[PDB]
Design an enzyme around this catalytic site. Structure first.
Site, PDB file in Angstrom:
ATOM      1  CG  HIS A 131      -0.759   0.297   2.721  1.00  0.00           C
ATOM      2  ND1 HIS A 131      -0.715  -0.566   3.124  1.00  0.00           N
ATOM      3  CD2 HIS A 131       0.124   0.721   3.504  1.00  0.00           C
ATOM      4  CE1 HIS A 131      -0.490  -0.398   4.522  1.00  0.00           C
ATOM      5  NE2 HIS A 131       0.292   0.552   4.395  1.00  0.00           N
ATOM      6  N   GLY A 160       1.957   5.565  10.387  1.00  0.00           N
ATOM      7  CA  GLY A 160       3.657   5.578   9.616  1.00  0.00           C
ATOM      8  C   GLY A 160       4.199   3.784  10.024  1.00  0.00           C
ATOM      9  CB  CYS A 178       1.811   0.512   6.777  1.00  0.00           C
ATOM     10  SG  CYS A 178       0.233   0.026   7.606  1.00  0.00           S
TER      11      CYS A 178
HETATM   12  C1  LIG Z   1       0.339   1.358   9.470  1.00  0.00           C
HETATM   13  C2  LIG Z   1       0.141   2.365   8.988  1.00  0.00           C
HETATM   14  O1  LIG Z   1       0.561   3.544   9.213  1.00  0.00           O
HETATM   15  N1  LIG Z   1      -0.574   3.248   8.321  1.00  0.00           N
HETATM   16  C3  LIG Z   1      -2.860   2.869   8.061  1.00  0.00           C
HETATM   17  C4  LIG Z   1      -2.812   1.615   7.104  1.00  0.00           C
HETATM   18  N2  LIG Z   1      -2.781   3.522   6.061  1.00  0.00           N
HETATM   19  C5  LIG Z   1      -3.273   3.379   4.627  1.00  0.00           C
HETATM   20  C6  LIG Z   1      -3.945   1.351   4.602  1.00  0.00           C
HETATM   21  C7  LIG Z   1      -5.603   1.947   4.829  1.00  0.00           C
HETATM   22  C8  LIG Z   1      -5.857   1.605   4.452  1.00  0.00           C
HETATM   23  C9  LIG Z   1      -6.417  -0.301   4.984  1.00  0.00           C
HETATM   24  C10 LIG Z   1      -4.754   0.190   4.302  1.00  0.00           C
HETATM   25 CL1  LIG Z   1      -4.095  -1.652   4.106  1.00  0.00          CL
HETATM   26  C11 LIG Z   1      -3.895   0.335   4.602  1.00  0.00           C
HETATM   27  C12 LIG Z   1      -0.855   4.575   6.252  1.00  0.00           C
HETATM   28  C13 LIG Z   1      -1.248   5.217   5.382  1.00  0.00           C
HETATM   29  C14 LIG Z   1       0.060   6.045   5.157  1.00  0.00           C
HETATM   30  C15 LIG Z   1       0.617   6.917   4.133  1.00  0.00           C
HETATM   31  C16 LIG Z   1       1.508   5.247   5.011  1.00  0.00           C
HETATM   32  C17 LIG Z   1      -1.279   4.299   7.499  1.00  0.00           C
END
Ligand SMILES: *CC(=O)N1CCN(Cc2cccc(Cl)c2)[C@@H](CC(C)C)C1
Ligand SMILES: *CC(=O)N1CCN(Cc2cccc(Cl)c2)[C@@H](CC(C)C)C1
Lengths: 304, 304
Positions: free
Chosen positions: B41, B143, B145
């Site tokens: 993602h 952040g 992830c």
């Molecule tokens: C893990 C983390 O920091 N974030 C949660 C997921 N976001 C994107 C997202 C949205 C919906 C489903 C999934 Cl699998 C992933 C992240 C977004 C940022 C811009 C990295 C944040």
């Protein structure tokens, strides 16, 4: 979101752990620059521990008697000295993995991570609080002595604790890195009174704010209280008296959630007087006191 | 003595963390050998997350679009590929800090440490259990992830989890290091049902043995039960059914304490039916299920 008892990443500390052997006793040492710090009881034998004469025991020891191993490499000991309850073994090589560091003497109620070690090797890491009675409720078996407690501010490791002993009650006692014990404890196999402990009120309040931030709000009520009224309840339930300094440190959390510190005190008052009623807060069925207001802000913001 | 929710020393994992940026999205990556693993993602924009077409989104990306930084040094991306829900970015340099490692797919009820990271930098470490419903109850902000879960067997790090998302309920979902989600979750901003969770019975029993080893014995009773009778109580209280494999894994703890597994089941039965009666076990007011029998043996013996 989510709230966990989080420890600091232990990498910078792992790189400092060494094994120290003196005669037949082996424990952990902390190698920083060209000095290895370890508990002075490494020089004792089983018969010495009732009341060791450390000055006399150390006199029978020479630099070559202190065996210091960092993984598989042997360090060369060129100096030895006792400072309070720690031995400082000067080695001929600065630890290439020495992080930026400080030795700090933490205050009761403050938290730190512990890297439990056996034979110079890290086994695990957990978050501790220095109890108001200067003991820690850790997990330490035989051989864990010399394991250290620390906090990390960006790249700087502030070492605050070194493990020395377990009291007959299963609680742990140790020193700062200058070898001064926290509390009234002495390094001898004697029954020692840990003072009456109390719950760290400012931390329980900080944890209630963390609960509100993360969705657990059931405990919030239509009441308020005053510092004096709350302190009458705190005294009854063996909670540390709340001061204006504590209210001031809760300022950021009060600002973020919009819940005045005294209103949160009234929630805590009702939780103390009524219990949890079979409910939980942040996955716990009791009031948690080992998260400082700083820990809550750090975890809830994402400081690395 | 003492029993704590202990995480593995995170040093070997810290040395693998990198920051991955694609367009305007930044998350964490795991640099092992000449490959950087991160959630796919990272290639999405805010408008893409309702139902991303990852194959199409990745086509608009070239090796130069993936910015990978390990601390202050920039890695050169020479290959990119999607495997399930992870991106594998081949870099021209093997990570000098790559530990001995394996990718493992853990079973529900098993535990692991999580190194929460933001912008490629470690913030903290905590012990998690993969719930029977394949979610984890972590602490992860925006952040985080790309942060990973792992176990360490002497010098080998078995990576088992990579963080991808937080469900609307505040629980966390992610993948193994081949990019396969644990549970039925998909990487999209959709409301997703986490299955009915249950308590990990074998772990609660393992924790009761840890309590007996460490002095907390008040819950021991004059009763015994059978697997079938205990399982009727487990079903009622949403506990995982206990099998002979679970009894067998509790063998060492039963042997050390001299308390037959079924006698401990009767203690658990009475605790489930009567509650704790305002008492605690290992400092907790509820039944803990995030310690495996292996975790208990490791902590109680001193494995490094
Ligand atoms: C893990 C983390 O920091 N974030 C949660 C997921 N976001 C994107 C997202 C949205 C919906 C489903 C999934 Cl699998 C992933 C992240 C977004 C940022 C811009 C990295 C944040
Ligand atoms: C910390 C550790 O592993 N050990 C606890 C203290 N033992 C010696 C001792 C006894 C009484 C009082 C004090 Cl301050 C210290 C350790 C003994 C081994 C041989 C290192 C074990």
């Amino acid at each position: 979101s989510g709230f966990r008892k989080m420890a600091f990443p232990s990498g910078k500390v792992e790189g400092c752990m060494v094994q120290v052997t003196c005669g037949t006793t082996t424990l952990n040492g902390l190698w920083l620059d060209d000095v290895v710090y370890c508990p002075r009881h490494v020089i004792c034998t089983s018969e010495d521990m009732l009341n060791p004469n450390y000055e006399d025991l150390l006199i029978r020891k020479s630099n070559h008697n202190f065996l210091v191993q960092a993984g598989n490499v042997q360090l060369r000991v060129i100096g030895h000295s006792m400072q309070n309850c720690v031995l400082k073994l000067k080695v001929d090589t600065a630890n290439p993995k020495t992080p930026k560091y400080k030795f700090v003497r933490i205050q009761p109620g403050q938290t730190f991570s512990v890297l439990a070690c056996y034979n110079g090797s890290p086994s695990g890491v957990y978050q501790c609080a220095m109890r108001p009675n200067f003991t820690i409720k850790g997990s330490f078996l035989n051989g864990s002595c010399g394991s250290v407690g620390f906090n990390i501010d960006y790249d700087c490791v502030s070492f605050c604790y070194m493990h020395h002993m377990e009291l007959p009650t299963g609680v742990h006692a140790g020193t700062d890195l200058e070898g001064n014990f926290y509390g009234p404890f002495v390094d001898r196999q004697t029954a020692q009174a840990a003072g009456t402990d109390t719950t760290i009120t400012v931390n329980v309040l900080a944890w209630l704010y963390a609960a509100v931030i993360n969705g657990d709000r059931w405990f919030l009520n239509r009441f308020t209280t005053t510092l004096n009224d709350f302190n009458l309840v705190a005294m009854k339930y063996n909670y540390e008296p709340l001061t204006q300094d504590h209210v001031d440190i809760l300022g950021p959390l009060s600002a973020q959630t919009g819940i005045a510190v005294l209103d949160m005190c009234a929630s805590l008052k009702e939780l103390l007087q009524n219990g949890m009623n079979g409910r939980t807060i942040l996955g716990s069925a009791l009031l948690e006191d080992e998260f400082t207001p700083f820990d809550v802000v750090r975890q809830c913001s994402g400081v690395t």
